[PDB]
Write a protein that binds this ligand. Structure first.
Ligand SMILES: Nc1ncnc2c1ncn2[C@@H]1O[C@H](COP(=O)(O)OP(=O)(O)O)[C@@H](O)[C@H]1O
Ligand SMILES: Nc1ncnc2c1ncn2[C@@H]1O[C@H](COP(=O)(O)OP(=O)(O)O)[C@@H](O)[C@H]1O
Lengths: 138, 24, 370, 370
């Protein structure tokens, strides 16, 4: 999100016709070194459209549900909601290995929320039905 | 122009752009 | 080491070099492979036995100037050994083969063999860190700022038209010819014998080229000015000897438009470029009429492009606005274009690492050259 | 959703796009599917490598232009996806599928498979909540205000009269046919070869289409005007290259009425309309005689409907008053009529709730698209 926001801000800075006008004077001076390198050699536009490609996947993701729920039903349906949000794949073109290890890190974040919700009963000594019901729902 | 002076094999008095007499 | 890369403004007749980012190459010199033809009698005589630079530019009365780049195409790799051997002089470099990346250039429609053997040289004998070699037309377009444009580039035994739209892979449409000023100057030596000037040395040929760039122009009327009485411009040697010219100064470049005058079937620069136009598309053709990149020092003549404008006007149909772009530095446009391209960060993939060629071969780079 | 409902102008040849309430389809463009025919070895060229919009509508021969709607029946799907991504482009939409109600139009008797693909797109890739897929002639009835009428569409490879009466489901009576000016223009490329014009590109075909849409018409007298000889007026290429038009301008569209010129047995869809008339009833036939609609871009020709008038006059019996209605905005009639229907409250029941519809499979709206 910070990347997209910075893309917007600095792209307005980029598209500031004053600096572009300085570049007009520079190209009029034919010093195409800096001008052409600033245009071509800067892969900023590529980064812009790349984050614009990931833009819907980087938008309204239901991850806070795992951060704000201690119910296996809520968490499980939150998993489903998250999963559905993760269908923006081919329409975003994210790196396979980065996607794998990304969702892998997400699974670790999930396990962290699982330990968070887990640390509340200790049904090994307290009631066995807690063990039964909670274990099954888990 | 300064680079045009810096190197020897550079001639002048000829416009770098040659176009047709585009009759309007 | 990947420091400021050495931008080498090559060339059939004038092969020089400089760096990236800079706007003036510090090593400006042509193509010339000379060596003394006499016996050192008195000791203390200046030597080196392979004279290039001020030696050659000083001791012209003793050297046998050789040329591997026949029509730009190298024919003598040993002469290339000596060429770079002189290039590799620190007074000519102030570096090593590895102290800077190298940026060498090419001409379109050339065999692999050239790149192969050269890669062997600069990555085995010499040991260049990073280097890529390609057409000078692209670099010229860099200097023009244009991307879509027919690069009319001419060497000195080379004359060619390179149609380009944003640097696309169009080798069928892209043309190339290898015939120019070397041969024209040789034909001027033929003029000399017809005039009575008994000359047959390469050093004399240098002077003919000095006239070519100096006391030789163009006209626009072939037959008309041929019928028109000349003035016989008396050239003067370094000695100062009277050398009349006549209309031969512009008569010899008629062969560039009339290739059969030397007995060589072709169609002239104009028609060959028109053939390149034919391979393009009507809409893109109009752009290329407006996008004409004349380049090469050989193209420096009085109304050169203006005559050619009239030629293509007689060739191209009506309501066709032809526009030429031809800077005064139709040499360094390639050098500055390489100075910019070599100054890029994406250029990593564009260059070729030393070890890469040292791993498998130049065919990988031949994949990279297209 | 409480936003402006998108009206997909899924034109066969020219697939435009727009919304409801508006009277102008947002963006108009054909089935062109371009990809460059070269390689941008030079850095500084243009990106994309797939071109929809002025990128392709400005450079054609450079790009491998494609067209998958095999007589409307699209075969590409990935390209369609990208086209719809381009539908949400910056100039184009900058919106979401979820953010807008979308309405699709279709030709009758299309394969369910295409609708399945569309469901996959707008329910997996895109996520339109209010997505409905409809017919195309009903739209024309909305624009004309009529309810009863013979709607003749005119695509690039799809033309068929749609005899409607107050939206009554008459699939047996109503006739669908997929053929139009595509192969007529290609047949004109056959004429080009028979007249010495070496053209094989779709871009060249588009130039011929510019002639088709521009310098072509329907001569009401078939052989009375065909057996004669025209002066073959001259057409000018993008370069301005003079090319004669010829009798072809009216000779080639006769194939629309004389399908055996290509060899395919058919009637000349006006006779298929007569078959629809036969399927209808005597006095109701008279209503449809008085009610004929001409939509689609390919309707635009001189004496087009007038020649067809003469045809039916040679077909329909005596005291048969027939009336046609050809709105100036043929393709837009469908678009504006889609805007009309998309601007309806009853129309909310036409589609099915997105997620449940996905769970409902496709047969539900397949049964509800009638
Ligand atoms: N005024 C001139 N008239 C004719 N020829 C020239 C002139 N100036 C330079 N040349 C020739 O043009 C050639 C330079 O153009 P360039 O593209 O650098 O070609 P090259 O490949 O020969 O170096 C030189 O070799 C030189 O002999
Ligand atoms: N002035 C014109 N004359 C003839 N045909 C035209 C004209 N303008 C557009 N067209 C035709 O419209 C067709 C485009 O197909 P289109 O009408 O978009 O399909 P659909 O009828 O399904 O919308 C092409 O045949 C094109 O030739």
């Amino acid at each position: 999100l910070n990347l997209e926001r910075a893309l917007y801000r600095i792209q307005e800075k980029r598209e500031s016709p004053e600096v572009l006008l300085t570049l007009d004077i520079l190209k009029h001076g034919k010093r195409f070194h800096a001008t052409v390198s600033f245009d071509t050699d800067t892969g900023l536009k590529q980064a812009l459209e790349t984050v614009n490609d990931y833009n819907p996947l980087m938008k309204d993701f239901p991850l806070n549900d795992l951060l704000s729920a201690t119910e296996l039903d809520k968490i499980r349906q939150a998993l489903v909601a998250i999963f559905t949000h993760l269908r923006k794949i081919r329409n975003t073109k994210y790196p396979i290995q980065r996607a794998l290890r990304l969702v892998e890190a997400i699974s670790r974040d999930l396990s962290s929320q699982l330990l968070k919700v887990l640390g509340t009963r200790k049904l090994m000594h307290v009631a066995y039905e807690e063990f039964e019901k909670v274990m099954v729902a888990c | 122009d300064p680079k045009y002076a810096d190197l020897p094999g550079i001639a002048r008095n000829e416009p770098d752009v040659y176009e047709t007499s585009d009759l309007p | 080491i990947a420091n400021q890369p050495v931008v080498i403004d090559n060339g059939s007749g004038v092969i020089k070099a400089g760096f990236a980012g800079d706007q003036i190459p510090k090593y400006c010199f042509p193509n010339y492979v000379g060596r003394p033809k006499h016996v050192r009698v008195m000791a203390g005589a200046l030597e080196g036995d392979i004279f290039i630079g001020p030696k050659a530019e000083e001791h012209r009365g003793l050297l046998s100037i050789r040329y591997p780049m026949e029509h730009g195409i190298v024919k003598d790799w040993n002469d290339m050994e000596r060429i770079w051997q002189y290039v590799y002089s620190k007074d000519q470099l102030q570096t090593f083969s590895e102290e800077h990346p190298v940026l060498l250039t090419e001409a379109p429609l050339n065999p692999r063999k050239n790149r192969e053997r050269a890669a062997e040289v600069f990555f085995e004998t010499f040991n260049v860190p990073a280097l890529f070699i390609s057409m000078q037309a692209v670099l010229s377009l860099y200097a023009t700022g244009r991307t879509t444009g027919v690069v009319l580039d001419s060497g000195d035994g080379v004359t060619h038209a390179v149609p380009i739209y944003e640097g696309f892979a169009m080798p069928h449409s892209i043309m190339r010819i290898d015939i120019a000023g070397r041969d024209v100057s040789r034909f001027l030596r033929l003029y000399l014998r017809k005039e009575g000037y008994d000359f047959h040395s390469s050093s004399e040929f240098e002077i003919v080229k000095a006239i070519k760039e100096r006391a030789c122009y163009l006209s626009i009327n072939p037959q008309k000015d041929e019928t028109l009485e000349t003035e016989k411009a008396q050239y003067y040697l370094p000695d100062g000897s009277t050398i009349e010219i006549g209309p031969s100064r512009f008569r010899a470049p008629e062969l560039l438009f009339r290739p059969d005058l030397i007995g060589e079937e072709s169609e002239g620069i104009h028609e060959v470029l028109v053939f390149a136009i034919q391979k393009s598309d009507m809409d893109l053709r109009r752009t290329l009429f407006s996008n004409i990149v004349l380049s090469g020092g050989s193209t420096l003549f009085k109304g050169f492009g203006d005559r050619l404008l009239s030629e293509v006007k007689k060739l191209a149909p009506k309501d066709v606005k032809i526009r030429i772009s031809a800077p005064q530095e139709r040499l360094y446009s390639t050098w500055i274009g390489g100075s910019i391209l070599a100054s890029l960060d994406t250029f990593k993939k564009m260059w070729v690492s030393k070890k890469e060629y040292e791993e498998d071969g130049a065919r990988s780079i031949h994949r990279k050259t297209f």
